[PDB]
Chain length 321, copies 6
Amino acid sequence: FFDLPLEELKKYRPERYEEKDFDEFWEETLAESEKFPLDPVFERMESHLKTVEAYDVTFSGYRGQRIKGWLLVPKLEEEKLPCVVQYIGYNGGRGFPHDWLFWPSMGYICFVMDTRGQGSGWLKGDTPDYPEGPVDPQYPGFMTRGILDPRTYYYRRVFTDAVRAVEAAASFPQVDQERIVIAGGSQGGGIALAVSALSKKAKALLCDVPFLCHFRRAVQLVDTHPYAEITNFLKTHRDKEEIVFRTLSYFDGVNFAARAKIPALFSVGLMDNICPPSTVFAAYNYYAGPKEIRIYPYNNHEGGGSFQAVEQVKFLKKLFE
Amino acid sequence: FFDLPLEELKKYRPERYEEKDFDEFWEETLAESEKFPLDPVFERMESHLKTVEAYDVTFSGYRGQRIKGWLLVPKLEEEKLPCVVQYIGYNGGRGFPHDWLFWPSMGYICFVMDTRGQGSGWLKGDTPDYPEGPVDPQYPGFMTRGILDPRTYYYRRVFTDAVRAVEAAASFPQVDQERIVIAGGSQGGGIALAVSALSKKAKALLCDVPFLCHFRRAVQLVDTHPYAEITNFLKTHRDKEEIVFRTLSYFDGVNFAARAKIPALFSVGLMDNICPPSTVFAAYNYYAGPKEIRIYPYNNHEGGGSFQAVEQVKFLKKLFE
Amino acid sequence: FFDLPLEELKKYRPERYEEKDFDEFWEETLAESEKFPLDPVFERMESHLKTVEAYDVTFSGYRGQRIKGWLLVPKLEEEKLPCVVQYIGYNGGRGFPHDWLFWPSMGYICFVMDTRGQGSGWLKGDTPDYPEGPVDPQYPGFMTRGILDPRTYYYRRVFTDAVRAVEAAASFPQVDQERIVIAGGSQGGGIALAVSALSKKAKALLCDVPFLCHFRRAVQLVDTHPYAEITNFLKTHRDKEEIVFRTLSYFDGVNFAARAKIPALFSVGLMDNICPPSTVFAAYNYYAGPKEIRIYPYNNHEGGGSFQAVEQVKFLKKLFE
Amino acid sequence: FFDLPLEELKKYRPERYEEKDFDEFWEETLAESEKFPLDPVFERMESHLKTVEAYDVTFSGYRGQRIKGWLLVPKLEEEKLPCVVQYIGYNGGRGFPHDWLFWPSMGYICFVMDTRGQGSGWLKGDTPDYPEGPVDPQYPGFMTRGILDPRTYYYRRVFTDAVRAVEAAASFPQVDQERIVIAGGSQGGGIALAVSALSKKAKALLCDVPFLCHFRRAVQLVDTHPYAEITNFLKTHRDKEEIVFRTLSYFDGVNFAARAKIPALFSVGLMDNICPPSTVFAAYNYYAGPKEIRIYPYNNHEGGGSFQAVEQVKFLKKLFE
Amino acid sequence: FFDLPLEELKKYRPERYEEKDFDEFWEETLAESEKFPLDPVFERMESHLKTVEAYDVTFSGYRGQRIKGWLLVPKLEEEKLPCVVQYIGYNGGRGFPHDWLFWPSMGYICFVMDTRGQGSGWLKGDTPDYPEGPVDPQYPGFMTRGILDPRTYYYRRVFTDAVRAVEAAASFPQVDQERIVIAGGSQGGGIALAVSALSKKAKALLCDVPFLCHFRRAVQLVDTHPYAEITNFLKTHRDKEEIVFRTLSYFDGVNFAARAKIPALFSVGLMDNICPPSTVFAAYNYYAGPKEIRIYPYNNHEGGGSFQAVEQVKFLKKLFE
Amino acid sequence: FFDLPLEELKKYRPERYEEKDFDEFWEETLAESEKFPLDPVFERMESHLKTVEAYDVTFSGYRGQRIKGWLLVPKLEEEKLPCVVQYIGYNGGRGFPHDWLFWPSMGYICFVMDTRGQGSGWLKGDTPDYPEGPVDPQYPGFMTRGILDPRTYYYRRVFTDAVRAVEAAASFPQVDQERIVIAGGSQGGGIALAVSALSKKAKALLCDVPFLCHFRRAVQLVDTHPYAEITNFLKTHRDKEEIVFRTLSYFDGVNFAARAKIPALFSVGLMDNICPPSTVFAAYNYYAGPKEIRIYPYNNHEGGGSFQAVEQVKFLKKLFE
Ligand SMILES: [Ca+2]
Ligand SMILES: [Ca+2]
Ligand SMILES: [Ca+2]
Ligand SMILES: [Ca+2]
Ligand SMILES: [Ca+2]
Ligand SMILES: [Ca+2]
Ligand SMILES: [Ca+2]
Ligand SMILES: [Ca+2]
């Protein structure tokens, strides 16, 4: 228990910081990227999978840039199926279709979005990043890539891909558009939280142990990666502190949470030192839609694991009845 | 690269040590346990799973003792299906049925055997151990539980459970008995390797990054857990070295490997410091059936991960054609 | 200094939790074990020791189960001598007679109780555990052995052995029954604290850096072993939290302290991260007999070491004059 | 002493691996970059420095891309001065002019080249990287940036900048072109070693504890950063091993050493676990110009420190007399 | 952020502890050492340095004992120059003259004082210690050397050397005595802080990340070296606590700060775990002369690095105008 | 198993290095110290000990300097008793008389020699060091104290004290001079090994896990303390390597071993990374008296513990029969 006591966590509502043009920044970003056609492509694959049909996905994300994915369709006769749009944790990518069998096995179509430029830490990826011209001085990783301007920042492109990925999923004929879920843990949870505010097609949020939340507090509290990337950049670039935190304000899950309206199930680990409970609770507490949180007092960053997976299936069945 | 070079590993065939009553010990063990009825029990569960039917399993393992499991049957039109008997890694247990979706998704029935007394480290379990009367002084864990006599040793009970689990899988009416596979990684791999020699029903072996191999070498090469449990016991019980290694000889995967005849696919990580490459290659090199090994030079204990999963599905398809 | 400031520690009296049948549970436990004869056996042994006479001890502890020990009698004229009953720290056992020369050299008979099932970490042991039938799923070690029911819990058996060990000590003809001391550090301190409430024969308590106190706090404060065994179990068995802490309440030194009436000398290390100062002070502050505590501000789990040994000798001399 | 014995190091000449188009790859790379004007710009700065004149440098490196630097001119009578072109270690950048006062104080003009895209770990930098279009999946850092093709690889651009930096230094009027030295440690040593083979203007090499050498051995010997970036990439991209090491062959300091003809002073630490001794000695032993090595048996990556600085000034004074 | 919040650090003024004879102790110490002639010697050396003239220094410090140093004079027209007296961090020594080029390069004469008995950790030294007869039992290092009596304590001798060093600097003919600066970081900062109170010749203080401050707090806050030397001594010498802290009170930077009158620039790293922020702020807040502090929220013991060096040059320029 | 295989250890006989005046260095040292009277003082203490009489010891060691100790005399009928002269491990000191009850309890008078200047790490001490004038630059600790000249080296004083301590023990009236044993582990083992060659009064050697052996190999093999003190000094003082090892050659237990003639029991731990097996076996193999070694394959620096204590008591009983 390195963070605030649970009774304080449940009341933790730090003063939010954002620029006055937060909404217009996102409006412009999305409008610019919408000028290129989504052009979603689903290509049925040869696979040894027998209970699922697998597709190779390509769609246009940030500024027409082509993003990879998987679509896994369980072989069921229902003609319209509910759908989970799955975002991936830091240093991961889309891997193989058989890495994402949970949701299909529970009767949901699953759209797995590949993460631009990552895919080299714990699960392979196939999608590149394409920067806004010059790749400024940065600390190794994705957290400080373009951090000196919100227009050049890595997560502007990732979040835009992620909103577009729900439009791609929704284009698939067998997808029931009234039951589109956005889902992620860690980095995937911060991605999903941004999508919960920016997407018009999402109907429910699953947000586990979310990353990209309350950056200023995260960086003071823990020296774990990946938050430590920001701290390290700041240790060197000692003149750049105000600019760093200004840029990060546009991407902070606490500021998106305050704008989100769809129902959400969160999870938190009270001993999580990658995504500290205070940062997760700041985002939960500001979350503006109907919401629940499952709290795991003795867990680190693994959170609720398979127990939470049961919670999520039960939560969505009840929500959509 | 902390172990022997790969050219040497490929030739590594250390002198084997076993007592002259090795076979006799195992014949008596199995014969005594076969006097109790198997009494396999499959009970269909209420589940949110849609592509698979899930059953709660109970069967009689060592000396009539009741062992839990899961059976996952993918919903397919084929009347008899191939089957994978899945053994679980150290400190794990059967978990939830949804933790084992890989093989059913590939069209295989999957029998997951719960590990007596464990189930408390990384995945929950439901099966107790039942000792041979007194539970001797031991180091924390399962590696030194009953280690002063092979008749009282923890893994005598686990290995008997595991042989009996293949008989329980085979009793299921929808299982094709010409296509029963035994599978495991780490502790699971060492259990499987025992079964490959002691079972008459297994038709193929999948053996990844195997544990319980070449104990004398393991304990001198690495200070990682769980092999360190034996070293720590020996650090205290300085008079018991000969007895410890005598007992461990009856449970050594290298001595089972020498007697196994069924086809096998192994995997090894050359930077694996939990299951060192020399202990895995010692088992592989003595393995007496038709065999292949996939070698992952830059991987630690994670081995080939999802890449190896693809290898296994291809391996078994071609074997059974 | 990772815990509460000293001025707060001295006032620390957290709300106690126990079940309404705490006393009955212990009355029944002891009554059931008293139905078996103590049958204490003292066997003079061949030894190179010249200033002390050494005996091999056997006595009936929990449910008639036979527990080993040593009795060390200093060679002194005096026909009745004072006696220290010594309990041992985690992963230790009775070792050799010469491991326990301190009290005999100070003119006290010393009864060393071996710890069932341990004796494999830092000092050898010779006494097995005997479980209540099935040995449930557990994390490696003794802390979570049978933890799902106080009737099956490992320390129910250890505490009962420990109460019976005083009765065995008292049976020795040369032991002065008006000067029987119970003594331990760490796990030994926690055992001794339980005995201070449950024994009718004990006349003084020495309790150093006590373990098995204020479990709920211990497990939120430190990630060291052995308290980490409980946390790790809870990380996996996420449905079992209330049950684990209910069981643990029956074995909590804070709850025994509240009932103990004999004079006591405690010790505490303010930088102790094995047995945190708040857990020790919770026990000390509830302690209901005449009491003193020696506080070592700069020491970790070593506590006062040989300085505390001098304090204990002086304490007892004054108490018994 | 984790590496080969010193007697073996001094004879260590492993089989070199390079593609048949190594030389044409570099000829083409240089020729393409030479089609843009160098356009070197030296802009005198306001500084508190009194013994040195400082200039802000900009010059065109890889494909006309503008690279920053510093030029420090000591205030001396002599109309033409000798010059050190200084390359910077991993995660560093040009910092402030006062971070480079050693060589000016010894009477040498010093050209400090900023490292594109880094400058955020231990010293600030001001130069971006500019990729060849898509930024492929990569592990955090510079080592695997573009690694699937030598044409896209990060160090193609760094090495081309570094060759052009000598041309920029040479264009300064007070620089004696017969006494241009190239210098670096760690990453700067590997950059300088590439320049020793590719530049026509360099007259002497100072190469301390060099990085970017014998990649295949580095990655199997040590788990330190930055070599561990490559290993971590390979752990995930298990199908890309042959491509990774093919690409890296074009950038290996051993293959450049084999072509270099100018006099060199090397240094090595025999306990260096960042740049292991065998990788440094491979480069030194293949180095084809007149050469010396200072060996520091008890030093890690710090090498000879200020002792080696003394050696360098003595070595150059003698060389140029 | 392991220490008090910044808003609390800015007000942190703990109760000071010192003996009534604090001033008398220092008066006597200085008076006794002043009875030996300073006998400062400056010996021009052969050097490859071209912009600086380098001198070997010898002067009489504590009790006539002969202390080494360097004097670096920048080659400038000006007939009187300002001067920095530079103290060195823990385990350092005077090194080579070229290790100290910063201040000469900025137009200042630089007197580098070697630290008696150290010079063996990160930079070589040439000055021995000379104890007050018997060298008492101590923990490895300098922090507990003679710690049982302030007259025998290591830093009595160091602080006296350091006061005498300003008198030696001031005896150099080209030194402007109106512009003598005392400077240090870490141990150097603590030394400089003592000199700021004890010297009559110093005109400004540069005090970075100061060590030797608020010992009682330092020792309970962090387990890093060198403050851990004191804690380890106290762990053993459990009877010596009051004596240790009594001695240390005579050498505490907080107590000297309260007496210093000259202008000062401090720096602090809020993540500094060697010299914690609270101990540095305690000294800064009690500092009795005109003062400023540069605060580096994201830096550990490196502090402001080269950024702070720029601040120091600008601070002194403005001060001396 | 980090060191040479046991078959190689048993034959390991590295080329010895010593100066031609090794023997004369020691003859002169002893001769000089013998010019001061031994002046042994035994003062009986008030103690709570009942089976042992305890004396405060003072005797003249190196150059008449007064060294503390304890003498423990077991209360027995025999008029002359055998005696163990006990040397203490690194950072230890004589502690309290009750810290040394083992030998007395086995019927041996025990002379415990306090270690000059230490006594601050794990057990308190009371004896200061007295240096040969100036205390040269050193790394924290005792290993590099005076290391630039054998005349000034710390262990010259310690080894002289130790030879004198046997003479002081022999002066006690109840000591049987035909049964005087010299005993130590770690640093104590290295001290005892020197005394085995330099004393004429010692009749047997107990040498456990010896330190101060084969320095050049120790320093290459391990980075543990205390050998790392020498390495760290060498890392800084890069010009002083030949001098450091020349000095150490006069104090190397391998060189004393080659001259010792009395019967000896050694012990070694094959996983000992403080005192590596090769350094212990180098000393063992050159030992020129009748000898045995107890080998503990799975033990680190704890060696054989209480098992070895049993071996020692058996060894001596048989020797003296
Ligand atoms: Ca707005
Ligand atoms: Ca047989
Ligand atoms: Ca009751
Ligand atoms: Ca017996
Ligand atoms: Ca070619
Ligand atoms: Ca006064
Ligand atoms: Ca001189
Ligand atoms: Ca001679």
